[PDB]
Amino acid sequence: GVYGGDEVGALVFDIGSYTVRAGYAGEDCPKVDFPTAIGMVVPTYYIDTNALRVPRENMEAISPLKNGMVEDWDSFQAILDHTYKMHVKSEASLHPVLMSEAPWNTRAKREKLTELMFEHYNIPAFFLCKTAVLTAFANGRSTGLILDSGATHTTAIPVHDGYVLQQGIVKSPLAGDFITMQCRELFQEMNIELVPPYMIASKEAVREGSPANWKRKEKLPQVTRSWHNYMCNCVIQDFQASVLQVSDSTYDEQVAAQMPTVHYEFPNGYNCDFGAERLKIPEGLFDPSNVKGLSGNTMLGVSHVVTTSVGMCDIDIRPGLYGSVIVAGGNTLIQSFTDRLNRELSQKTPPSMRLKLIANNTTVERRFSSWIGGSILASLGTFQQMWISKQEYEEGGKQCVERKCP
Amino acid sequence: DPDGPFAFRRKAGCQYYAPHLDQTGNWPWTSPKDGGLGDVRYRYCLTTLTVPQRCIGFARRRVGRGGRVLLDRAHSDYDSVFHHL
Amino acid sequence: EGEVTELTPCETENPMGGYGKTISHVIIGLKTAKGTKQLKLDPSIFESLQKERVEAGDVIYIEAN
Amino acid sequence: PIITYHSVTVPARCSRTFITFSDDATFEEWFPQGRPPKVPVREVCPVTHRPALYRDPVTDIPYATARAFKIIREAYKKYITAHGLPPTASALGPGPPPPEPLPGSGPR
Amino acid sequence: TLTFKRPEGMHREVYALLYSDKKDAPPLLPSDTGQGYRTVKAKLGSKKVRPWKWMPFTNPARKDGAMFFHWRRAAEEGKDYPFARFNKTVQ
Amino acid sequence: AVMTAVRAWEFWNLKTLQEREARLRLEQEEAELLTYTREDAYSMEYVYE
Numbered sequence: 005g006v007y008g009g010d011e012v013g014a015l016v017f018d019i020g021s022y023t024v025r026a027g028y029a030g031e032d033c034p035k036v037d038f039p040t041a042i043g044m045v046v047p048t049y050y051i052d053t054n055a056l057r058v059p060r061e062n063m064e065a066i067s068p069l070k071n072g073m074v075e076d077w078d079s080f081q082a083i084l085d086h087t088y089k090m091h092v093k094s095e096a097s098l099h100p101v102l103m104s105e106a107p108w109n110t111r112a113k114r115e116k117l118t119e120l121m122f123e124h125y126n127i128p129a130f131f132l133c134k135t136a137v138l139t140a141f142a143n144g145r146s147t148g149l150i151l152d153s154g155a156t157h158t159t160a161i162p163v164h165d166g167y168v169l170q171q172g173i174v175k176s177p178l179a180g181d182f183i184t185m186q187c188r189e190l191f192q193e194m195n196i197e198l199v200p201p202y203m204i205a206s207k208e209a210v211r212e213g214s215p216a217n218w219k220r221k222e223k224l225p226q227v228t229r230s231w232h233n234y235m236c237n238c239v240i241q242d243f244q245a246s247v248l249q250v251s252d253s254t255y256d257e258q259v260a261a262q263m264p265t266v267h268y269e270f271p272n273g274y275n276c277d278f279g280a281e282r283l284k285i286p287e288g289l290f291d292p293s294n295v296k297g298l299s300g301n302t303m304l305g306v307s308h309v310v311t312t313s314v315g316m317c318d319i320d321i322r323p324g325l326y327g328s329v330i331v332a333g334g335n336t337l338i339q340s341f342t343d344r345l346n347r348e349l350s351q352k353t354p355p356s357m358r359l360k361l362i363a364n365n366t367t368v369e370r371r372f373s374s375w376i377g378g379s380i381l382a383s384l385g386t387f388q389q390m391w392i393s394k395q396e397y398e399e400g401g402k403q404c405v406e407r408k409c410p
Numbered sequence: 411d412p413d414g415p416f417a418f419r420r421k422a423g424c425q426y427y428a429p430h431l432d433q434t435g436n437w438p439w440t441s442p443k444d445g446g447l448g449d450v451r452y453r454y455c456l457t458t459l460t461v462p463q464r465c466i467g468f469a470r471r472r473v474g475r476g477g478r479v480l481l482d483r484a485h486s487d488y489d490s491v492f493h494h495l
Numbered sequence: 496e497g498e499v500t501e502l503t504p505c506e507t508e509n510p511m512g513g514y515g516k517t518i519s520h521v522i523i524g525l526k527t528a529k530g531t532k533q534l535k536l537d538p539s540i541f542e543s544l545q546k547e548r549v550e551a552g553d554v555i556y557i558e559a560n
Numbered sequence: 561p562i563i564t565y566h567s568v569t570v571p572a573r574c575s576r577t578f579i580t581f582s583d584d585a586t587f588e589e590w591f592p593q594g595r596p597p598k599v600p601v602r603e604v605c606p607v608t609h610r611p612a613l614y615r616d617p618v619t620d621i622p623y624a625t626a627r628a629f630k631i632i633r634e635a636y637k638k639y640i641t642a643h644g645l646p647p648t649a650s651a652l653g654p655g656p657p658p659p660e661p662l663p664g665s666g667p668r
Numbered sequence: 669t670l671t672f673k674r675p676e677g678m679h680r681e682v683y684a685l686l687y688s689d690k691k692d693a694p695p696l697l698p699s700d701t702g703q704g705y706r707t708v709k710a711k712l713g714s715k716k717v718r719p720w721k722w723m724p725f726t727n728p729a730r731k732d733g734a735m736f737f738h739w740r741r742a743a744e745e746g747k748d749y750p751f752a753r754f755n756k757t758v759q
Numbered sequence: 760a761v762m763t764a765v766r767a768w769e770f771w772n773l774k775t776l777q778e779r780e781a782r783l784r785l786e787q788e789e790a791e792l793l794t795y796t797r798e799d800a801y802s803m804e805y806v807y808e
Contacts, residue, residue: 006750009475012736100736129734144685327437358434363690383475385728385751393734439685452683455807456673459799462528463792465673466696468682471805479800481696484688494529504591507772510566511764515582519772538579541590542564551594570765599703604710661716670804696795 010385015092016378018104018135019083021069022155022180022334025375026087029102029382033368034375036091041067041234042079049082052090057235059202061225065234072106072156073113081120088125100129100391102382104374107134107161107168108175114409115402122397129391131382132409134168136161138377139332142369143362147321148328151310151345153335155180158289158306160313164321167410174313176304178289180244180335186285186295187240199272200235207273216274243268247282249339252347255287286338290348307348326357331364332373454484456492467492497527498554505535527554562586606648606665607631608655621668635665718743729755 014029020040027035043050043063050056050063068079088096101121105114114132121127136150140163150161158179162172191198199216203224208217247266260280269275288295290305304312314325329349331342346361353359364370381387392408411417420426436446454468468484486492505520520535521544549555563580581587603612606621607628616622620636623629631652638647648666650656674681682688700708721742724735729752 006753008473008477010738010751012738129736323435356434358436360440385749386754388736388749388751389728389730389755391734391736393730393732395732395734399732437685440683442681442683448683452685454682454684454688456675457805458671458673459795460670460802461796461799463795464529466792467693468688472695478698480698481795481800482687483693483695484682484684485691485693486682502591502593504587507768510578510580511568511761511768515580515584516587517578517580519576519578538577539565541579545590550596552596552598568765570762571769574769599707601706601710602708604714606714609714658718660718663714663716667710667713670799670802670806672805672807674807694790694793696792698797698800699794700797702794702796 007385009383010388011383012100012388013098014100014102014382016102016104016375016382017084017087018138018372018375018378019069019080020154021067021072023371024083024087025372026091027375027379028092029379031379032376034372036087037372038091040069040083041065042083043231044079047078049079049086051083051086057202059225059227059231062228063231064228065231071108073109074117077116077120081124084125096125096127099127100131100382101127102131102133102378104135104138104378105132107136107159107170107173109134111406114405118392118397118405119402122394122402127394129393130397130405131391132405133378133381134161135374136163136168137166138375138381139330139373140166140328141377141380142373143328143330143364145328145330145362147324148330148362149310149314149325151306151329151331151333151336153179153289153306153331153333155335158309158333158335160309162313162317162321162325164324169317172313172317174304174309174316176306176309178292178303178306179333180241182288183244183248183286183335183338184237184240186288187243188236189296190281190285191240194276196270196274196276197272198236198239198270200232200239201271202235204272207271210273210275212267213276214274216270216272218272239271244338247278248286249283250286250290250341250344251283252340252343254291255284257284260284286341289335289341290344305348306345307352310345310349311352323357326353327360329359329361330373331361332370334367334371337365337367337370454482457481465492465495496554496556497525497531499549499551500524500526500531501533502549502551504541525555562590606654606667632665721745725749728752 011030016027016029016034018025018034022040023037024040025034025037027033038052039056041056042065043056043060044066045060045063050058050060056065066076066079068074068076068083074080088094092099103117103121105117117132118130121130135152139150139152140146140148145163146166147164148162150159150163152159152161156177156179158176160172160174162169197216199218203220205219205221207219210217247268249266251260257280260283263280263283265277265279266282267275267277288298290307292298292303292305293301310329314322317325326349331345336342342361342365346359349361350359364373369376390408392404396404396408433445438447438449439452442448452470454470456465456467457469458465466481466483467486467489470482472480472482474480501522501524503522503524504518505522507517507519508514510517518538518541521538521541522533523536523540524531524533526532547555561582563582566578566580567575568578569575581590603622604610605612605624605628608624610624612622613624614622617629617632620632623632631654635647635651638644638651646664646666648654648664650662651665654662654665656662700712705712719742720739722737722739723742723745724737725740726733726735726749728736728749
């Protein structure tokens with residue numbers, strides 16, 4: 005007869021703006037997860053936290069990606085070389101590679117990526133799939149609406165029979181980076197001087213709201229403003245993960261003020277208790293019209309993004325989209341995000357349609373769904389005919405990826 | 411025209427699927443007949459083992475990777491009753 | 496009823512007086528098919544217990560009243 | 561003296577038994593406790609497998625059938641010399657169909 | 669011999685794709701050594717594994733003839749790939 | 760005056776038995792069963808009547 009799956013020695017890479025997820029196919033979690041941002045000195049590149057977090061003179065901090073697509077190919081190549089050398093620790097010519105890509109990735113970047121992987125790394129086989137499809141596959145769904153709220157974008161992607169419906173995509177920029185900017189504005193309003201850990205030699209405990217008592221390292225080299233801002237944002241991201249909480253209903257200041265506070269201590273020893281402002285900040289994801297200094301009321305909340313994306317699809321598949329809403333991305337891990345989204349969508353979905361959000365609320369499942377789907381797909385024995393081979397590339401060139409990887 | 415433009419003007423030779431009027435449909439899974447198609451491969455049922463460990467409550471049989479046959483299990487509020495039933 | 500597994504005496508040293516070693520309970524663990532349970536019986540059972548000549552791995556029968 | 565009974569009722573109003581064995585050494589001969597092997601080794605015949613039957617012979621290892629016994633007694637004449645060829649490497653066709661391959665029948 | 673139960677006297681059943689609830693108990697996996705190794709030392713010791721090998725294979729219904737690698741028993745080298753039978757094309 | 764000692768012993772024994780009950784309740788935690796035998800897995804019968 006037949007057997008179940010089949011393991012072929014493949015590798016799965018899912019590269020985002022925030023971190024690079026990589027590992028071997030067949031495993032249920034990525035082997036490694038390190039930041040996508042890297043240092044440059046001029047070029048010489050420094051990758052991963054242990055080399056990135058050390059201060060160094062004239063070292064700029066960059067990203068290879070822009071709008072979810074590759075711009076700096078030298079940085080991307082450096083990241084891949086680092087991943088192959090230090091983390092995978094195996095020769096690249098032996099392992100097939102399945103790569104994740106953005107739903108909106110252009111043809112030219114797909115062709116350039118295929119050319120890079122086949123001609124430089126000399127891999128034996130290649131496949132390229134979109135994030136939403138793998139996110140659906142990780143939850144056992146072929147049809148469903150993927151809501152991915154990452155760092156750069158909050159996007160609703162409808163999926164049907166393992167294919168992205170590109171004309172139904174709705175992008176919004178309100179995501180983790182926007183929340184980081186709002187936290188920066190909050191600290192400026194509160195007159196909270198933010199000192200990253202690298203500047204601190206030692207610290208002493210102090211009271212709530214009192215000035216910090218800390219000593220600065222004397223042996224520091226002069227560092228660029230980009231690296232300093234990246235280090236500050238690393239602190240603000242911990243603040244996001246710790247303190248912020250979505251209001252269960254529409255934000256009322258008098259109700260949020262009565263909630264218990266949350267204590268947070270900064271690396272320099274400054275500490276204070278945070279009240280309603282920790283709930284006012286993430287409310288802009290859902291009701292951006294009340295945000296201060298935001299450019300116009302034209303932009304959409306998360307629920308309205310979902311409904312617009314579903315309404316732009318064919319009427320026959322909308323039950324299948326509302327019956328499987330797969331929430332994904334790290335920014336969805338803010339406390340009570342999913343409950344608020346479910347309530348708002350229940351208030352806006354038609355009563356004739358049943359709404360069902362997939363139970364997915366863990367860090368591993370929310371952040372690494374695309375990688376898990378890639379591992380699942382590469383582990384299928386039915387999939388093994390779908391690889392682009394090196395022979396196919398040498399015969400048909402880089403244009404074969406459009407035919408073979410829709 | 412009672413139904414307006416949307417009268418069911420049948421055409422010869424065609425076949426038609428009726429709509430769900432009484433209850434909204436649902437997937438083949440996470441969905442009993444009280445809501446949707448109950449494909450039995452997704453169904454959990456009470457099960458007993460020949461080794462003396464008792465009724466294990468609701469369960470399916472599923473083949474995993476490597477040809478290994480596993481028993482899934484599902485939570486019930488009456489698991490304490492299914493044990494010492 | 497079930498397979499005996501313990502034959503475990505408890506201990507509290509003294510019966511509130513001049514003493515050697517005092518048990519105050521006897522822990523008897525039974526397992527048959529469905530599960531396992533420990534019973535802290537009256538110490539008086541011990542006479543009847545070796546009168547029946549039970550050991551670990553035996554299977555017994557005890558009436559409640 | 562082991563004091564077969566002592567009941568006091570003193571506290572709720574109650575009733576107890578406090579057996580006091582005394583003499584130290586009297587305790588363990590009344591409570592030896594136990595630690596038996598819960599199950600045995602499940603024995604399999606070296607020749608054609610299936611569960612073992614009867615027991616071992618007067619020497620060596622158990623068997624399932626008279627044919628297995630005959631092969632085992634034709635075996636061990638190759639080993640009483642305490643030197644020679646492999647006494648049991650596929651000796652005398654000891655049930656050789658390999659759904660999963662078999663070692664030699666020399667477990668003793 | 670072995671019993672499963674779908675009673676009329678209680679009348680309930682549940683369905684799920686991945687799992688019913690986060691409180692679901694984990695699955696039950698097969699095992700041979702649950703009763704200890706000494707229980708089954710002779711059964712395992714009277715047998716020898718068939719060898720496996722990391723080995724090339726062809727025809728998943730590919731047109732290029734590219735050979736990928738996998739784990740299979742060494743006696744099963746020249747066999748055609750089973751999953752090629754799924755390669756059905758719409759007419 | 761031994762009734763004071765008996766009272767103290769009874770309180771101590773009650774505390775000890777409550778501690779044992781809590782210990783048993785903790786011992787009832789985690790997965791009670793993670794594995795089932797080969798014969799059950801590959802019986803293929805699993806029938807209802």
